[PDB]
Design an enzyme around this catalytic site. Structure first.
Site, PDB file in Angstrom:
ATOM      1  N   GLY A   1       1.041  -1.805   0.013  1.00  0.00           N
ATOM      2  CA  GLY A   1       0.249  -0.399  -0.317  1.00  0.00           C
ATOM      3  C   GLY A   1       0.910   1.025   0.002  1.00  0.00           C
TER       4      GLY A   1
ATOM      5  N   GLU B   1      -2.352  -2.025  -6.190  1.00  0.00           N
ATOM      6  CA  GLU B   1      -3.228  -0.741  -4.996  1.00  0.00           C
ATOM      7  C   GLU B   1      -3.441  -0.571  -5.962  1.00  0.00           C
ATOM      8  OE1 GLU B   1      -2.888  -0.912  -0.671  1.00  0.00           O
ATOM      9  OE2 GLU B   1      -2.729  -3.440  -0.768  1.00  0.00           O
TER      10      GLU B   1
ATOM     11  N   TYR C   1      -4.872  -5.846  13.467  1.00  0.00           N
ATOM     12  CA  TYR C   1      -4.572  -4.395  14.104  1.00  0.00           C
ATOM     13  C   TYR C   1      -6.652  -3.425  13.195  1.00  0.00           C
ATOM     14  CZ  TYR C   1      -5.575  -3.218   9.198  1.00  0.00           C
ATOM     15  OH  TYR C   1      -5.949  -3.204   7.778  1.00  0.00           O
TER      16      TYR C   1
ATOM     17  N   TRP D   1      -2.816 -10.052   7.813  1.00  0.00           N
ATOM     18  CA  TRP D   1      -2.384  -8.841   7.504  1.00  0.00           C
ATOM     19  C   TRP D   1      -2.723  -8.148   9.103  1.00  0.00           C
ATOM     20  CZ3 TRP D   1       1.492  -7.079   4.748  1.00  0.00           C
ATOM     21  CH2 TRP D   1       1.995  -5.725   5.480  1.00  0.00           C
TER      22      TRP D   1
END
Ligand SMILES: [Cl-]
Ligand code: NA
Ligand code: NA
Ligand code: NA
Length: 336
Positions: A73, A116, A236, A317
């Site tokens: 990203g 991305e 997360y 991830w």
């Protein structure tokens, strides 16, 4: 079939501290795309870790498979670079050739494309060309050398909330990639929705139109079979500051967003943990601190969802964000 984990090289977790027992597939993130040559390169910082990644992890789980992830990203600039690479047959060729050679030279079982994101109908067509040519190179390199063929995957947008999924060629993906890692997270972040608490990666979102379920459904509708989709799991979440510590449910008034926080740092907070089974998310609060994220319950719930829909599996991830392998263990246990 896939219990996937991304190892992010800048995370601080050393390869030798990875517990590959809870995974079938490990992604080593990321090799860089060189804008000049359009070759896959490894930074001088990553070269030692990447070159011994597979040997190291297989010492603990010999049946684990490894792939080298490409991209990240890295914002619109990196998207631009992929876009320009994909636009010309000769650029695609440099990328394809170098990616395969790098995978072989560093003992990886596969490659994972993380562009991305394709963001036009031309990007879409070029993406299809890139992956068909990549599959063709992978089949040719395998047949001509005798070496077992590289695996090919891509990490892809997980909802129209993230990026328009119409710019992915679903049929070309189904015929050319072994599976895709559907990035079903970061839908409702505290940066974008600072004034009300959210489930950042909800399985269902009945107050709106975007969710992991919407994304998975769209991918299936787009031409990719469920058996080639891996559901993404974030390790997360996102933090908000509450207006009122007594008003602390989902969609509670908040004064601002307080960023993204690793699972292992959310658990540190203690406080009170809740589970919303309509949206399928956890959340956690202490005073005016509120966190929306996946804890063991929502992880188990998502993995069960994946298995019931006949998905290929799941991926996380990223693995360093876990706490003593709690979510990794939970996901593996849920799958069976
Ligand atoms: Cl909303
Ligand atoms: Na090399
Ligand atoms: Na295939
Ligand atoms: Na505030």
């Amino acid at each position: 079939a896939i219990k996937g984990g991304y190892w992010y090289s800048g995370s601080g977790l050393a390869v030798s501290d990875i517990n590959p027992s809870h995974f079938t597939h490990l992604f080593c993130a990321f090799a860089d795309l060189d804008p000049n040559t359009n070759k896959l390169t490894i930074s001088s910082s990553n070269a030692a870790a990447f070159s011994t990644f597979t040997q190291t992890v297989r010492a603990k789980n010999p049946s684990v498979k490894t792939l080298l992830s490409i991209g990240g990203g890295g914002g619109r600039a990196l998207a631009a670079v992929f876009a320009n690479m994909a636009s010309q047959a000769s650029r695609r060729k440099s990328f394809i050739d170098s990616s395969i050679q790098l995978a072989r030279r560093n003992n990886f079982h596969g490659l994972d494309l993380d562009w991305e994101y394709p963001s036009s109908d031309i990007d879409k067509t070029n993406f299809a060309s890139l992956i068909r040519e990549w599959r063709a190179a992978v089949a040719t390199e395998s047949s001509t050398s005798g070496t077992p063929a590289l695996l090919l995957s891509a990490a892809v947008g997980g909802s129209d909330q993230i990026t328009p999924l119409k710019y992915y060629p679903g049929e070309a993906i189904a015929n050319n990639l072994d599976w895709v890692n559907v990035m079903t997270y970061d839908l409702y972040t505290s940066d974008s929705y600072p004034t009300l608490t959210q489930p950042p990666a909800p399985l269902f979102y009945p107050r709106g139109i975007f969710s992991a379920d919407e994304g998975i459904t769209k991918w299936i509708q787009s031409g990719v079979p469920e058996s080639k989709l891996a559901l993404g799991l974030p390790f997360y979440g996102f933090k908000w500051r509450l207006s009122d510590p007594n008003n602390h449910g989902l969609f509670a008034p908040a004064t601002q967003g307080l960023g993204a926080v690793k699972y292992k740092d959310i658990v540190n907070t203690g406080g009170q943990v809740e589970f919303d089974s309509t949206y399928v998310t956890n959340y956690r609060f202490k005073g005016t601190d509120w966190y929306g994220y996946d804890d063991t319950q929502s992880i188990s719930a998502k993995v069960a969802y994946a298995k019931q829909r006949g998905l290929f599996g799941y991926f996380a991830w990223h693995i360093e964000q876990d706490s003593n392998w709690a979510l990794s263990e939970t996901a593996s246990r849920a799958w069976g």
